[PDB]
């Protein structure tokens, strides 16, 4: 009976009626980092890429023969 | 044209959502939009 | 003489195709890129 009442208070204060819902907000922070840590990569990755594709361009429409 | 109009589409649908839920600073009962 | 130049012509003509193809998918992806990260929020 003891094993048992444990057990049920363990499963309503799981995720029953848990007032903690700051877990939610860690969740949110974690991948509101995680897609701004993407973005920014994306972003260096596409001004790096139009700078080479400038340079690239300088070179190839000024080239003809 | 095969995947980027995907992933737009996606995010337009999610984007209607998130905009069905706009904060007005409201004080008596606006409960609207600021635009509005 | 006139042969090593048609020939010379010939690998720059290749070079600037294989050149133009690379641009494409270059122009592509930045074009992706660019409208892709534009529609977020």
């Known amino acids: 009976l003891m094993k048992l009442v444990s057990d049920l208070k363990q499963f309503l204060i799981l995720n029953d ?37 400038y340079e690239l361009e300088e070179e190839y429409y000024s080239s003809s023969s | 044209d095969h995947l980027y109009v995907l992933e737009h589409n996606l995010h337009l649908l999610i984007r209607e959502f998130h905009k069905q839920t706009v904060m007005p600073h409201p004080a008596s009962a606006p409960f609207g939009h600021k635009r509005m | 003489e006139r042969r090593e130049i048609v020939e010379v012509n010939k690998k720059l003509k290749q070079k600037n195709q294989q050149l133009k193809q690379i641009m494409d998918q270059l122009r592509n992806l930045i074009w992706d890129i660019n409208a892709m990260l534009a529609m977020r929020n």
């Not at chain 1, 009626?17 to 260096?44: G, H, W, Y």
Request: some cysteine.
């Open chain 1, 17 to 53: 009626f848990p007032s903690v819902n700051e877990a939610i907000d860690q969740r949110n922070q974690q991948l509101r980092a995680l897609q701004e840590e993407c973005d920014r990569k994306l972003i260096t990755l596409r001004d790096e890429v139009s700078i080479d594709l």
